[PDB]
Symmetry: C3
Subunit: 401 residues, 3 copies
């Protein structure tokens, strides 16, 4: 539409990196592609990863940090080190920092639930770009071991290339059949990087795992549910959870807050602005619209600019620091918030009866600030008795189907 939305990143702007019959691994366009208004976010990327019941992403390490949030189902994740090796179950809500270089792999042990993970990634080397290192050799990726010379591999493993090749790599087989339809496996596990897993294996693999279930609190060891603490804002229109970095060792070096806002249908996250935090917002569920307010630099009276977009499962949108936002709900809307620059943030609501900086003004300034009489503004301001969330005067039925 005339006057576009730089800050809106619909579902579609995910580029598939990897689809096989067991899961997908999408990544979102670089925040600074079309826009040049989102430069401070040049490093961050958003990955959605998805898998089907009883499945396994093969071991991977990346040149990037990861903050996992399970927006759907269960997974055991394992994280492997030079020294120890770990494993956590993770339920809906759970988040987890995978540091940069950790060998990890994620199993979906559920029997009928797809796994849905959304990852913020912070590249280490180059800005907006990381890569996935697999030891596995599939028809889809090769091992890094392949990038070594036979001599080097042979010294390395202390083994005839022919034995390495047979065991770690794979042999010459340069044709094709790849037709006919049913389902089974390939090589050993449904070929590719996302493979089908046996219960035998799920049982073995989960047996080590540190169970979540109980909503674990932001520590430095295991997963932490974004609903662990009591809502920060809670009433009968929604819930607002949030873990600020300073109270969360696992990410405090990344200076990320994480939020989980549930907006009930016909409800409205009343307008606020984030004082220093740039928020990357992720739709898990529901439908709605938002209104972000900017000053159109463009290039008489300084014009403000609404940047609106419909919302739905999968979309990303971004909230620049200082920019007032508000968010509707046609259907029960659930949002995941990655707040960059979040340490010391303060969310300033602009309506209703808490953290309302407009009311916190000096009487006589309200006076000078708005055309109404002082008293008219206290009354008006006070007409919204709900805080944080309210009713949005929703649409409904009447002579309608």
């Amino acid at each position: 539409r005339r006057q576009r939305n730089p800050y809106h990143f619909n579902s579609q702007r995910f580029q598939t990196l990897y689809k096989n019959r067991n899961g997908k691994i999408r990544v979102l366009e670089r925040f600074d592609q079309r826009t040049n208004r989102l430069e401070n976010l040049q490093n961050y990327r958003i990955v959605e990863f998805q898998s089907k019941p009883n499945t396994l992403i093969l071991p991977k390490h990346s040149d990037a940090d990861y903050v996992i949030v399970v927006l759907n189902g269960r997974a055991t994740i394992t994280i492997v080190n030079p020294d120890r090796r770990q494993a956590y179950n993770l339920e809906y809500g759970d988040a987890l920092r995978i540091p940069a270089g950790s060998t990890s792999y994620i199993l979906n042990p559920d029997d009928n639930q797809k796994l849905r993970v959304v990852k913020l990634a912070i590249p280490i080397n180059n800005p907006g770009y990381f890569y996935d290192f697999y030891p596995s050799s599939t028809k889809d990726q090769q091992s890094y071991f392949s990038g070594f010379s036979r001599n080097t591999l042979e010294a390395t493993f202390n083994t005839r290339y022919e034995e390495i090749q047979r065991i770690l790599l794979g042999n010459e087989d340069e044709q094709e059949y790849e037709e006919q339809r049913r389902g089974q496996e390939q090589s050993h596990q449904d070929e590719g990087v996302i493979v089908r897993v046996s219960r035998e294996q799920i049982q073995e693999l989960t047996k080590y795992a540190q169970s979540s279930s109980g909503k674990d609190k932001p520590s430095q060891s295991g997963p932490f549910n974004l609903r662990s603490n009591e809502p920060i804002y809670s009433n009968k229109y929604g819930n607002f959870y949030e873990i600020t970095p300073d109270r969360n060792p696992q990410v405090q070096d990344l200076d990320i807050s994480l939020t989980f806002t549930e907006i009930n249908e016909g409800a409205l996250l009343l307008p606020h602005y984030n004082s220093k935090a740039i928020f990357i917002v992720v739709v898990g569920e529901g439908n709605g619209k938002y209104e972000l307010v900017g000053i159109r630099d463009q290039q008489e009276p300084e014009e403000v600019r609404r940047y609106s977009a419909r919302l739905s499962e999968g979309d990303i949108f971004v909230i620049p620091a200082g920019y007032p936002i508000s968010v509707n709900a046609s259907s029960n809307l659930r949002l995941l918030g990655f707040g960059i620059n979040a340490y010391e943030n303060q969310r300033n609501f602009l309506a209703g009866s808490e953290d309302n900086v407009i009311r916190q003004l000096d009487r006589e300034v309200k006076e000078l600030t708005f055309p109404g009489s002082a008293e008219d503004i206290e009354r008006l301001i006070k007409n919204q008795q709900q805080s944080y969330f309210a009713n949005a005067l929703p649409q409904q039925q009447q002579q309608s189907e």
Copy 2:
């Protein structure tokens, strides 16, 4: 002149953002406009803001940090939060960090003194660019509330748009008279973002205010006078004050030192270099010349480069780390220094008899370093018995008017 001055930012390179009859709000060209030698300063901007007696900037928040220094007069500043609301008087000399997102507004309660504020700003979102958010609706800026849809505003305030509009915004009135001359007000306060204020109001507004007067010391709460501590360098040619970040909680996260150098007429801030700190220097008062020394990369003997410029009330100039500087005074010259990267800085004077790194040399190296005999250099070096500042052999009168 042939061989320009990248580092000099005369008064003129201020772009007005806002002039009405009550004050101005200028901002300085981005440090990396013409030059590409000033990249590390790409984020910082310098705002001068000015107002006339009994006046008020309307409430504003920005997507940027602010370090205020009052180079002229008095002001009450208020800073408003989701929770509390504060207010300080500020006299000449006082500085104050306005964090990013703080609702603030500045009154000039004086009866005949113009208020002069110089702000370093550090944008949060985008590099070299911030914006001003006002709830006010004037003939000059609109409210961010205007960027919301009527439906959204109506849910928000819990009020008929028509009542919001009447009280918080303003109504349709699409013509003009804007002629005839006298002075009074407009709407309620002299229209625009800088408005005329009543004593009734000044009295009320200042009644909360935490008075400065007494030269408050670098804390984390209120304003701090850049002359609070005893001069760091003081003799009969000038005074050199400076608050390093590590001894100043309010900015220590920004890693800014602030200086206040008064150079007496015909005096001379002897040549030094800042070891890590990049200094942004601001002329409050007086006239003089400076000499900055660089190595002209250009593109036989490596050539050095003087970058000189006359000085006067309002000018900015910048001192790259490591680059030797010296500053004259035709008239009593008063400078405000924003030292970026200032934590652990050490100012190395190169003449006179303190912090003189040339004299700190090994005898026998002086020997090898300069053409003179060792003894000739100790004597010479020692011919300047004043430290830090000295006499500049000024110009004066003789058969002259």
Copy 3:
């Protein structure tokens, strides 16, 4: 060769900045010249500095930090401050942070040993660019004092320009003879910035110096030998030393680890990857080859990319975080490692029997990960009983000369 090596910086890509008959001062091309894959290293530069016995670099300060490592011989370094003045002997192995702005100069007191220093530099002002400030006036560089005006110099030193000029600078002499051959001196010390020194002087100059000899431990005061601690990895194929930033006050603000890997002939630093650290690797001695593994983004099965290069005294190469590396040795190969982003790094070996993350995998995942049976992989993996370094099945003789 088709498919170039961005990460390889042979000896040749050093640009001489300064050669006279007493030493050279080379600097390496900006890590982001040809490549745009090395952006996070845009600031760092590598300087090799070399001098001949009984010599002196004249006093210099830079707008950049320095981490010195002596890869050959001995030096006294002096570091001069506004306040105190210091001096350390430094033997092979020793490293030292010269902060930004420290007046320093380096003497080579040895009688027959050339001094070889390799410096990582981190510019302060501009990214990839620093400059050298000398008070000396040679036929090669001028003093910064020259960049001041006569009036300014005269106030400064409190001396007739004609006396300054005679003692600190040098006088007009605008011709040439610069022929005939023997050796002696010029002006006072072999002209230029690197000069010939007397024993009389070496004796005097070293008399202050804090002797190294004993392998001093990472403190915050003096030089620290990169072999101070016991090897981190040691067996009969090499030694691997490393000082991580958190255990080394002098650099912990720079977040640099330093390594010293000695690979014995026919030995092999087995393949690993650095989890967060980007390593800048410097060849002191020996010959060999390396294999770095990357994912060629390029632009069916994701291709990996070997980036190989022969090695020899002087070469630089770089190891991106996460990228597996391995290094051979034709001759006793000695490497200096500048690990950027090194705080919390963990080196993951991929072969042999320590810190082997492949073996740390879950049995049943190895199962799914490689084509071999689980048991075949444990056996194979276990066929390399040496850790860290091993034998490379080297080349040798047979019907050969």
